A paper describes a structure:
Many of these proteins are oncogenic and necessary for tumorigenesis. (NTD), the middle domain and the C-terminal dimerization domain.
HspD-NTD in complex with ADP, AMPPCP, AMPPNP, ATPγS and geldanamycin. and ATPγS were disordered, it appeared only in AMPPCP. nucleotide, interacts with all the three ligands. interactions with all the three ligands. with geldanamycin, but does not show any interaction with AMPPCP. phosphate groups of the nucleotide, but shows no interaction with geldanamycin.
Numbering used by the authors: 2 to 214
């Protein structure tokens, strides 16, 4: 097999944020689940609204749903949506190379005490909450306008993007969190089942919890 892999450097402030998220103790890291579900919901909304003005956008995948997959053997939590998806350029621009002023301000407020980790989503950097519980994050995504791509980072100032040769999504995003050893309790069946219930009260799309044994 062969793949071309492109390597990118994180914007300096995003690199600093990732370092802060990883190298500091946080008591309650539950916000990561809220943020991942929120992104899935937003993506489903986007394709849903696009369909109202152009019905054909749904032809790649008719269902609009979220699947959450804890896998203890693999030490992974996977969240799949059939939302809008991201092109390669979408992933480069949205997941590391561009920072908004929310990043600097969040780090300031974390240090001053004005903000805690649970408010990360108010600063426009909700995605990076994944690194509270994960050593490596892998983002597989398929947008109607591009081939399926896979973004991966274990922080440390770099991410990679490659044409995806794993299972076709049709359309949407599959995010795979490789869980830190001390955060593996997030993969416990009843714990994740109940947290999903807790962080999906206002979600208007079906959620399926698929526990891998
Ligand atoms: N499942 C998904 N499908 C499509 N795009 C996604 C996605 N998850 C993340 N993204 C993209 O990455 C960007 C960054 O996500 P992130 O959650 O950090 O910020 P956000 O724009 O959702 C505001 P917030 O900080 O409130 O969550 C999003 O704006 C979106 O474009
Ligand atoms: Mg978000």
């Amino acid at each position: 097999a062969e793949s071309q892999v492109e390597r990118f450097t994180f914007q300096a402030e995003i690199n600093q944020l990732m370092s802060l998220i990883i190298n500091t103790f946080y008591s309650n890291k539950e916000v990561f689940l809220r943020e991942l579900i929120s992104n899935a919901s937003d993506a489903l909304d986007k394709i849903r609204y696009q369909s109202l003005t152009d019905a054909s956008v749904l032809e790649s995948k008719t269902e609009l749903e979220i699947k959450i997959i804890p896998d203890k053997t693999a030490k992974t939590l996977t969240l799949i949506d059939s939302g809008i998806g991201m092109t390669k350029t979408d992933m480069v621009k949205n997941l590391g190379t561009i920072a908004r002023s929310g990043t600097k301000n969040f780090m300031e407020q974390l240090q001053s005490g004005a903000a805690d980790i649970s408010m990360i989503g108010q600063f426009g950097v909700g995605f990076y909450s994944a690194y509270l519980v994960a050593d490596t994050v892998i983002v597989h995504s398929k947008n109607n306008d591009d081939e399926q791509y896979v973004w991966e980072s274990s922080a440390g100032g770099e991410f990679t993007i490659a044409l995806d040769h794993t299972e076709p999504l049709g359309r949407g995003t599959k995010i795979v969190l490789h869980m830190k050893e001390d955060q593996l309790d997030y993969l416990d069946e009843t714990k994740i089942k109940n947290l999903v219930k807790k962080h999906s009260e206002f979600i208007q799309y079906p959620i399926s919890l698929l526990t891998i044994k």
